[PDB]
Amino acid sequence: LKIQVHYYEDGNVQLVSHKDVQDSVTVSNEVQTTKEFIKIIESAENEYQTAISENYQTMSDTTFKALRRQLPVTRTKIDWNKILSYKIGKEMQNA
Amino acid sequence: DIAALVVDNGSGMCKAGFAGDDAPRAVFPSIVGRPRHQGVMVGMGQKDSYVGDEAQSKRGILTLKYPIEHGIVTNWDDMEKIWHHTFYNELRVAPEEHPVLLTEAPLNPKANREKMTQIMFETFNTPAMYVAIQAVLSLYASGRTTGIVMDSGDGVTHTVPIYEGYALPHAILRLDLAGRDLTDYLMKILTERGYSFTTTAEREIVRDIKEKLCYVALDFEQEMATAASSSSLEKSYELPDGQVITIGNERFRCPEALFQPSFLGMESCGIHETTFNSIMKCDVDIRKDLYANTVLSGGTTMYPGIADRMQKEITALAPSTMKIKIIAPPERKYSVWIGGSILASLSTFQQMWISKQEYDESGPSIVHRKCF
Amino acid sequence: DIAALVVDNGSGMCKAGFAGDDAPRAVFPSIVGRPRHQGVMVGMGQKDSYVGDEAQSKRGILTLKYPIEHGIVTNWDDMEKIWHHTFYNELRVAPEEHPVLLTEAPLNPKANREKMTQIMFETFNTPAMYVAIQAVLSLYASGRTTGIVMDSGDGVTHTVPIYEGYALPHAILRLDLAGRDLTDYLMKILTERGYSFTTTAEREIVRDIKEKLCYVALDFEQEMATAASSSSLEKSYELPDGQVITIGNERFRCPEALFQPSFLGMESCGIHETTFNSIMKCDVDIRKDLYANTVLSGGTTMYPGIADRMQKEITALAPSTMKIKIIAPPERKYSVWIGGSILASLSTFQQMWISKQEYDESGPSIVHRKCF
Amino acid sequence: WXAXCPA
Amino acid sequence: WXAXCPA
Ligand SMILES: Nc1ncnc2c1ncn2[C@@H]1O[C@H](COP(=O)(O)OP(=O)(O)O)[C@@H](O)[C@H]1O
Ligand SMILES: Nc1ncnc2c1ncn2[C@@H]1O[C@H](COP(=O)(O)OP(=O)(O)O)[C@@H](O)[C@H]1O
Ligand SMILES: [Mg+2]
Ligand SMILES: [Mg+2]
């Protein structure tokens, strides 16, 4: 399964994503065997697209949160007047 | 040469010392004693007011009041006398030669620290000072940098979570329930036995019975059934008159008011649910380390059996996957002051003192900017 | 014959009436009160649960619980009391012969709507019912078939762009920040001047103080400087026990939390950025149609000055060639209900009720493929 | 009373 | 306190 997408309004954002799928099947006549093949493909693409939708509903607080934090552990913007105070916890990790 | 002065200035009891020691120099109750009778032997020690220890021993003829009530300074003319007695009598050091580290409870009214700073500079003429949060110092003194501190002194209870040294102001929880509210509930429940303590002089005897006999129970209903089954929990206490009172069941009914404020006609939840909600208000990623460094501090948490009870309650509230550790230092009565001293001894902290010349620039409101 | 009933029953307040009128018959605070103390006087009638306006009238002796939290029903056995009170005490009509139209905030769990229709069918025996999106009706109340509705109930917020009646389900932006969070933050900032409202009853005092005095300023920093430099933004309020409090800076700090959720401890975007993202999430050929017909709604948008402020923020966010125009009706509070009375009164809507027969032949899940 | 006050 | 509670 392979996907690519690009959005270019005032900036470039691009999704590229590939998944391997593998399984096995038990044969019958060609006709019913075909309906096994399609039922697998339907389940597989439905699960892959489901996984993607859940992933975009989860990245902001997990993956995209990893690189940078939407807000600090304080849950409030930095107070640039107080800036020396943010040292003192890490001073006590050396103390 | 010079060293900073660390004064806890907590509600009910006052502690003070020099920055850089492992123990507070002087601890004295924050009581202002005034004579309520009229002396008849003039010239034999007549003083308009007695403060500190002299207001404890002479309580038989004094009316005693607390300058700080629920963490808020209600009488500034009495806070001034308490501070004067702290500086000039217990430590016997002038204020104009040392920095002063005051401590404040979270979510305290705006004018509190403002008037604190104003009095520190305009009356005592201190060179430098600071106003630190009473709770954050306990985690410093505990020897950690992540966890939630449960600070329940005499006037205010508060749970504050701190991660990596940075506090989380959005998840600070405060509860007006405190040790003086337990004293008052004991003064009520003791009447069922036939005892009457209503006088401010006798509130001190009630406080002494509390911190000597009362103890938190692990299963309140089971201990109630134990007391109702056979009298084996009663203890005899002797008042300063020599009467032999006997409190039995009333041992754990007083500390239990911490976990069920409905006993005091209050709507809020107990200390365990308070800590639980404060933790679940913290960022999800850090919660894993929070549940492991839940630290008790302050006086009122020194109850016999409070550790096991807190652990049981918080682990029955929190999921089973989480590791619940109620770390209880065996000296948590002074942890706030120990942490204040540790913080004041830091060279990095030598730039965080609000200086006098800085105070002259923007008035007392400057305290709102520098202090976190 | 029979006339269809409309019941909003959103967070904070339940508004219900008969379809065909231009105002809801009954508006009452959707709370449930439990007596906090045990009665001592008999022969005067005692209830175990006061519901609706009776609870708010007697809030001094009750613990008040809101059956809905953040738009998701949290305690169904109180929601059934709410609905029973609505049907029998305010509207005064048996539900077993009146079709009912309910509302739901978008993006709410499927189990919520499922349990809602199951209760409405099996407990109250209504002949048929329907469930519409709470924000879509408010765009019908303004007569606009197209436009972006920003609904901000007391407890939930949602921006929905609707074109030609078919609302776009890919641009419906949810927001948990609403009136109740603004009440909590108002309590927390009132603490700054020394006013501590903490009980469940006093939340209604602070709620009223917000509904009356608070207002959103155009420029936050300029108004902050003004409120700091002089006393002309001071307003006095009279609590229901006679005390007179005074609030200054807190008047606009509280509602501004809608535009900068950082103030409240929320990582999400403000309501202006939320509306702009809801307009940007749809096509570029209808983005302009959405800009000119931005409709406000819900109680939390009744603040004085929110229209001009929202307009400024959006025109600063949007390009300079799009014409911004904030449509703020004068009766936003009931806009969702009014739009309902229209929809139910349509002569083409009566072929869309989920009939009880249709319910039993298809189970509750049929609500997930009949209501859009 | 027994402790405090007489009664 | 000034409002609600004594202090
Ligand atoms: N073991 C104990 N049991 C009950 N109460 C205690 C115990 N130890 C201390 N306290 C109470 O806690 C309070 C002391 O806390 P402290 O840390 O001094 O804060 P503060 O300085 O505000 O009094 C007092 O009310 C004291 O009686
Ligand atoms: N001007 C205002 N200032 C502050 N809050 C307001 C104002 N107007 C309304 N509210 C809040 O919104 C509520 C009314 O909302 P409403 O339109 O009934 O929707 P919901 O039913 O979701 O509450 C009020 O009770 C109040 O809490
Ligand atoms: Mg203390
Ligand atoms: Mg609404």
- Domains of chain B by residue range: 3-134+336-372, 135-176+270-335, 177-268
Stretch 275-304 of chain B: residues touching chain E, C-beta under 8 Å:
none
For residue E7, the chain B residue with the least C-alpha distance is B69
Question: Residue with structure tokens 């006339």?
Answer: C3
Task: Return the ∠ at Cα C188 (arms to C187 and C190), rounded to 5°.
Answer: 60
Question: Residue with structure tokens 């993607």?
Answer: A52
Crossing angle for the helix pair C110-122 and C76-85, to the nearest 10 degrees: 50
DSSP SS3 for B67: coil
Are E3 and C194 in contact (CB < 8 Å)?
yes
For residue E1, the chain B residue with the least C-alpha distance is B72
Q: Strands C294-297 and C147-153: what pairing?
A: parallel
Determine contact, residues C258/C216, Cβ cutoff 8 Å.
yes
CA distances from B300 to B68, B153, B294, B330, B347 (A): 17, 6, 16, 13, 33
With a CB cutoff of 8 Å and minimum separation 6, the contacts of B342 are A92, A95, B137, B140, B141
Quote the distance between the C-alpha of residue B164 and its chain's center: 25
For residue C265, the chain B residue with the least C-alpha distance is B170
Smallest CA-to-CA distance from B296 within B279, B284, B310 is with B310
Determine contact, residues B62/B33, Cβ cutoff 8 Å.
yes
- What is the Cα Rg of chain D in Å? 4
Residue C243: its H or E element: none
Q: What span, in angstroms and rounded, lies between the C-alpha atoms of A30 and A38?
A: 12
CA of residue C368 to ligand 4 center, whole Å? 22
Determine contact, residues C98/C3, Cβ cutoff 8 Å.
yes
User: Residue B302: CB within 6 Å of ligand 1?
Assistant: yes
Q: Which residues of C67-92 are buried (b: 16+ CB within 10 A; e: fewer)?
A: bbebbebeeeebbebbbebbbeebbe
The H-assigned helical ranges of chain B are 54-57, 76-85, 110-122, 136-142, 179-189, 200-213, 220-229, 250-253, 271-280, 284-290, 306-317, 335-344, 356-362, 366-370
Q: What span, in angstroms and rounded, lies between the C-alpha atoms of B139 and B160?
A: 10
What is the least distance, in Å, from the CA of A73 to any CA of chain C? Answer: 10
DSSP SS3 for B161: strand
Where do the DSSP E strands lie in chain C? 5-7, 13-18, 26-29, 32-35, 50-51, 62-65, 68-69, 72-73, 100-104, 128-133, 147-153, 156-163, 166-167, 173-175, 235-238, 244-247, 294-297, 326-327, 354-355
DSSP code for C314: H
Give the number of other Cβ atoms within 10 Å of residue A55's Cβ.
12
What is the length of chain E? 7
Best probe of the A interface among C267, C269, C273, by most A CBs < 10 A, is C267
| Cα distance from N-terminal residue to C-terminal residue, chain C | 28
CA of residue B66 to ligand 3 center, whole Å? 14
Note the ligand closest to the C-alpha atom of B66. Answer: 1
DSSP code for C44: S
Q: Decide if B135-176+270-335 and B177-268 have a common fold.
A: no
Give the number of other Cβ atoms within 10 Å of residue C366's Cβ.
16
CA distances from C316 to C221, C270, C322, C324 (A): 17, 14, 11, 10
Q: Strands C128-133 and C354-355: what pairing?
A: antiparallel
Determine contact, residues C32/C64, Cβ cutoff 8 Å.
yes
Q: Would you call B327 exposed, middle or buried from its count of C-beta atoms within 10 A (0-12, 13-18, 19+)?
A: middle
From chain E, which residues contact B within 8 Å (Cβ)? 1-2, 5-7
Quote the distance between the C-alpha of residue B50 and its chain's center: 22
**Method for structure elucidation:** cryo-EM
User: Residue B11: CB within 6 Å of ligand 1?
Assistant: yes
Question: In one letter, which amino acid is B288?
Answer: K
Query: B215 is written with which tokens?
Result: 């103890």
Give the number of other Cβ atoms within 10 Å of residue C371's Cβ.
17
Question: In one letter, which amino acid is B57?
Answer: S
Which long-range CB contacts under 8 A does A91-94 form with residues at least 24 apart?
A91/B165, A91/B346, A91/B348, A92/B140, A92/B145, A92/B165, A92/B342, A93/B145, A93/B165
Query: C91 is written with which tokens?
Result: 């509207």
Q: What span, in angstroms and rounded, lies between the C-alpha atoms of C187 and C325?
A: 33
Nearest to D2 among B195, B197, B202 (CB): B195
Query: B226 is written with which tokens?
Result: 């134990």
Q: Is C93 left (phi over 0), alpha (psi -120 to 50) or beta?
A: beta
CATH number of this structure's domain C177-268: 3.90.640.10
Query: A21 is written with which tokens?
Result: 């799928």
Q: Would you call C370 exposed, middle or buried from its count of C-beta atoms within 10 A (0-12, 13-18, 19+)?
A: middle
Determine contact, residues B89/B31, Cβ cutoff 8 Å.
no
CATH superfamily, with its number, for domain B3-134+336-372: ATPase, nucleotide binding domain (3.30.420.40)
In the beta sheet, which residues pair with residue C345?
none
Smallest CA-to-CA distance from C73 within C112, C102, C39, C34 is with C112
HSE-up of residue B1 (Cα within 13 Å, Cβ side): 1
Q: What span, in angstroms and rounded, lies between the C-alpha atoms of B89 and B33?
A: 16
Q: What span, in angstroms and rounded, lies between the C-alpha atoms of B331 and B302?
A: 9
Smallest CA-to-CA distance from B213 within B195, B229, B201 is with B195
Determine contact, residues B122/B116, Cβ cutoff 8 Å.
no
B202 touches chain D (CB under 8 A): yes
What sign for the dihedral angle of Cα B278, C175, C314, C184?
negative
CA of residue B153 to ligand 3 center, whole Å? 4
Smallest CA-to-CA distance from C134 within C102, C104, C178 is with C104
Determine contact, residues B176/B300, Cβ cutoff 8 Å.
no
Confirm or reject CATH 3.30.420.40 for domain B135-176+270-335, answering yes or no.
yes
Ligand 1 atom nearest to CA at B255: 4
Stretch 60-119 of chain B: residues touching chain E, C-beta under 8 Å:
68-72, 74, 109
- What is the Cα Rg of chain E in Å? 4
